[PDB]
């Protein structure tokens, strides 16, 4: 609430030299921007040195402080320090509070210095994406025709592998390919839950594709629309989008768009990948008729940014909802970028409401300014469940409405494996309840009854495993 009010009152100015901005850059040991030197007193709870006097700012190595955009974002995001602190005295046990701006800079409190190559970007984090848009049903279309062979093929394989990192476990994905014949790239044949394991199969299968044949956009799009109308399998029943990874062409395929989505319930995002001289006219037409966007990826450097910008399009209906779209969501357990253990993050998007009282702006107000965030460490939750009054064989455990354990004696602060390691914080620790302990038939109905939010007791005999993984007891 204090972020929308301050931003609306902000006056866009382009001169910064005569009136400098003051802030603390996280990754430091400049006219137009003054820097602060903090005291950095050591404090408990956190495992580092923090200052409670101001909030730190993290700017990606690619983004540049000084841009009218960045410098403008560094003034209206300065009244946040007053409410960042005001939250702290009321609840002294408050952990990281972060505002992930859409520009790329994250302002978090309390101030703490940033942790080789810093590839962190606040717009790619799982807590940012889950609050920036509703769950989706993306199906990726990959052009594996002859003309994409060479450099543009390795750009496509990286691009597909880079956007699959923008999906959480609530989204459903599948990757297809057309080369005058449309087929899947993996053993799936339909939309999958896009968890840590399923995405690994798609990434591995995408890396093994070969470019040869004749392009055919009609067969590629018929397969794309058919797979989005299954309804036999579990799905998100939400944003249905199609990503087309091609270079260029001359085919519009307007008959397919007129047959499968007349009312335009399917967004089509088109990516033109690589450096070439083919026509990009039809590629832009599909992105405008269908409720989509047109992106260009000419090199490896443009792969990263262009693969998360499709989320501001998906957030347009969320903005127009108003106060009904402001509900706090909690992500899966994951490892904090600033090392703090296993944490979960609340989230709340913030809207652009300049001219709301005048009621006629509707120009950039359809986009979100950023996503808020507050972290809750699993240690705080475990303090609410006393254990020593119980026997050493009893314990508490709670799970997501997906089967993933929020807290469990088996859940360890270590990333989960997905296969055999080979040599020639980014991913959540998603451990299912049936994998945390031994799997029984009675414990499956217990798991389902807990997903549905019911309340019941059950006593039975089961197979438990000793603390060391060598014995079995009943």
């Amino acid at each position: 609430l204090e972020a929308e009010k301050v931003q609306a009152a902000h006056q866009w100015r382009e001169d910064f030299a005569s009136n400098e901005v003051v802030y603390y850059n996280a990754k430091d040991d400049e006219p137009g921007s003054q820097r602060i030197k903090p005291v950095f007193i050591e404090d408990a709870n956190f495992g580092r040195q923090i200052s409670y006097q101001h909030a730190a700012v993290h700017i990606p190595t690619d983004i540049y402080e000084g841009s009218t955009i960045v410098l403008n974002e560094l003034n209206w995001t300065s009244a946040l320090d007053e409410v960042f602190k005001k939250n702290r005295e009321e609840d002294p046990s408050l952990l990281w509070q972060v505002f992930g701006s859409a520009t790329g800079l994250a302002r978090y409190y309390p101030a703490s210095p940033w942790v080789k190559i810093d590839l962190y970007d606040v717009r790619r984090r799982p807590w940012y994406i889950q609050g920036a848009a509703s769950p989706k049903d993306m199906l990726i279309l990959v052009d594996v025709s002859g003309s994409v062979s060479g450099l543009t093929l390795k750009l496509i394989r990286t691009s597909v592998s880079e956007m699959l990192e923008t999906l959480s476990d609530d989204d459903f994905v599948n990757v297809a390919s057309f080369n005058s014949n449309a087929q899947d790239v993996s053993c799936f044949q339909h939309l999958v839950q896009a968890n840590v394991r399923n995405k690994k199969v798609l990434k591995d299968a995408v890396n093994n594709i070969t470019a040869k044949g004749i392009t055919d956009y009609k067969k590629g799009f018929s397969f794309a629309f058919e797979q989005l109308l299954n309804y036999n399998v579990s799905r998100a029943n939400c944003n249905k989008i199609i990503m087309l990874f091609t270079d260029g062409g001359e085919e519009r395929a307007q008959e397919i768009f007129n047959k499968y989505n007349k009312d335009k319930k399917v967004r089509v995002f088109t990516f033109s990948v690589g450096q070439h001289n083919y026509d990009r006219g039809p590629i832009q037409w599909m992105a405008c008729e269908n409720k989509g966007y047109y992106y260009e990826i000419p090199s490896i450097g443009a792969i990263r940014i262009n693969t998360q910008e499709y989320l501001d399009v998906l957030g347009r209906p969320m903005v127009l909802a108003g106060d009904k779209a402001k509900q706090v969501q909690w992500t899966n357990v994951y490892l904090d970028a600033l090392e703090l253990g296993l944490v979960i993050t609340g989230t709340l998007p913030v809207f652009n409401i300049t001219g709301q009282f005048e009621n006629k702006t509707n120009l950039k107000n359809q986009l979100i300014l950023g996503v808020m965030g507050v972290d809750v460490s699993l240690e705080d939750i475990k303090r609410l469940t006393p254990r020593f009054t119980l026997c050493p064989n009893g314990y508490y455990f709670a799970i997501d409405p997906n089967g993933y354990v929020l807290l469990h004696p088996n859940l360890q602060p270590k990333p989960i494996g997905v296969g055999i390691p080979t040599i020639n914080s980014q991913e959540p620790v998603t451990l299912d309840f049936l994998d945390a302990e031994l799997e029984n038939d009675i414990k499956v109905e217990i798991r389902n009854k807990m997903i549905d939010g019911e309340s019941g007791e059950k006593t039975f005999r089961t197979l438990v495993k000793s603390q060391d993984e060598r014995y079995i007891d009943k």
Binding site: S134, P135, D170, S234, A236, N237, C238, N239, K265, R280, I283, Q284, A287, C288, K291, G292, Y293, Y294, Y295, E296, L314, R316, P317, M318, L320, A321, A325, Q327, N362, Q366, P401, N402, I451, D452
Partner: peptide, 23 residues
């Protein structure tokens, strides 16, 4: 069980901002 909230298909959406409609 998936989320019970869903936000898409709003009539008031601008619809007019592509990446090639300008350039």
């Amino acid at each position: 069980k998936g989320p019970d909230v869903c936000f898409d298909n709003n009539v008031l959406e601008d619809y007019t901002d592509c990446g090639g409609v300008s350039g």
